[PDB]
Design a protein around this ligand. Structure first.
Ligand SMILES: *[C@@H]1O[C@H](CO)[C@@H](O[C@@H]2O[C@H](CO)[C@@H](O)[C@H](O)[C@H]2NC(C)=O)[C@H](O)[C@H]1NC(C)=O
Ligand code: NAG
Lengths: 49, 42
């Protein structure tokens, strides 16, 4: 109840922190993945248009 | 009231048709080609 600790010297410390910000941007083509260069398959894809 | 997309035979836009005349000063009607369809404008 009558004791206290007080510092007598200091130090300067440089730390690092790594933060993600953005990721890769992607695009997908409906044709050339579902029906690749097929006229019979692309004639049926319009019903899922 | 629909924006439906077809896939059939059509005349392509900005295509080059042939011109056949019938002037007097001639009379030509050659055997033309009928493929999947013919556009005829006289
Ligand atoms: C606090 O600590 C630093 C070291 O981190 C002390 O600096 C040293 O001081 C002595 C003399 O007291 C020099 O001979 C040294 O070159 C200094 N540097 C190092 C890296 O040892 C400093 O004196 C301390 N302060 C206090 C005890 O009040
Ligand atoms: C125009 O006619 C030419 C022949 O002169 C043809 O090769 C071409 O496909 C036609 N159309 C266009 C848009 O150039």
């Amino acid at each position: 109840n009558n004791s206290i600790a007080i510092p007598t010297n200091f130090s300067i410390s440089v730390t690092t922190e790594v933060m993600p910000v953005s990721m890769a941007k992607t695009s997908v083509d409906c044709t050339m993945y579902i029906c690749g260069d097929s006229l019979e398959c692309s004639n049926l894809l319009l019903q899922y248009g | 009231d629909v924006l439906h997309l077809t896939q059939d035979y059509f005349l392509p836009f900005h295509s080059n048709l042939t011109q056949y005349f019938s002037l007097n000063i001639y009379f030509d009607n050659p055997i033309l080609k009928f493929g999947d369809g013919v556009y005829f404008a006289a």
